[PDB]
Structure 1
């Protein structure tokens, strides 16, 4: 009942921190976008309507 946690608390913390580094560094340097007016005929692409950059990375690349 202790070998388990060093393994569960580890392989969560294995892929967990690089994520947390990813959410923090993106949210810090890249940042959410600011809302704007569609400029008379821009017809914005699917990715253009979402705020968070990696939340519109998935949208542009995969959906």
Structure 2
């Protein structure tokens, strides 16, 4: 069964990106302006 692994990756990717987006975008906005 490959379910448990893919689930794990779904979770992990989802969180690292969950917090991942606000941070990256924040860094970019800080780059272009201030």
TM over 0.5: yes
TM-score class normalised by the smaller sequence: 0.7 to 0.9
Match in the other structure for 1:12: 16
TM-score by length of 1: 0.46
Unaligned runs of 5+ in 2: none
> Which structure ranks higher in relative contact order (CA pairs < 8 Å, sequence separation ≥ 6)?
1
The Cα shift of 1:29 comes to 1.0
Unaligned runs of 5+ in 1: 31-63
Of structures 1 and 2, the larger Rg is shown by 1
In terms of fraction of residues, the more helix-rich structure is 2
Query: What are the residue-to-residue correspondences of 1:34-53 with 2, within 5 Å?
Result: none
